[PDB]
Amino acid sequence: EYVVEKILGKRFVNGRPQVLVKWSGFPNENNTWEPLENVGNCMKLVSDFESEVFRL
Q: Which ranges carry the Chromo domain?
């Protein structure tokens, strides 16, 4: 697939978590919501996002 650059958001769909992905080397109009379990190991990126939420 393509490469996750940054996590920009989180939501639940039917109770399951999804993240809004900014793809490396793609513009923002290419951002997509992906199941958390299908995002691969970018746990550092997920951690960054969650920290930013918790911050405010």
A: 2-52
Cα–Cα dist 10/19, whole Å: 4
How far is residue 52's CA from residue 30's CA, in Å, rounded to a whole number?
22
Look-up: residue for tokens 């697939």? 1
The C-alpha atoms of residue 40 and residue 29 are separated, in whole angstroms, by 21
CATH label of the domain that carries residue 38: 2.40.50.40
Number of domains in the chain: 1
**Residue 22 near residue 34 (C-beta atoms within 8 A):** no
Resolution in A: 1.5
Please tell me the distance from the alpha carbon of residue 22 to that of residue 31, in angstroms, as a whole number: 5
* H or E stretch covering 56: none
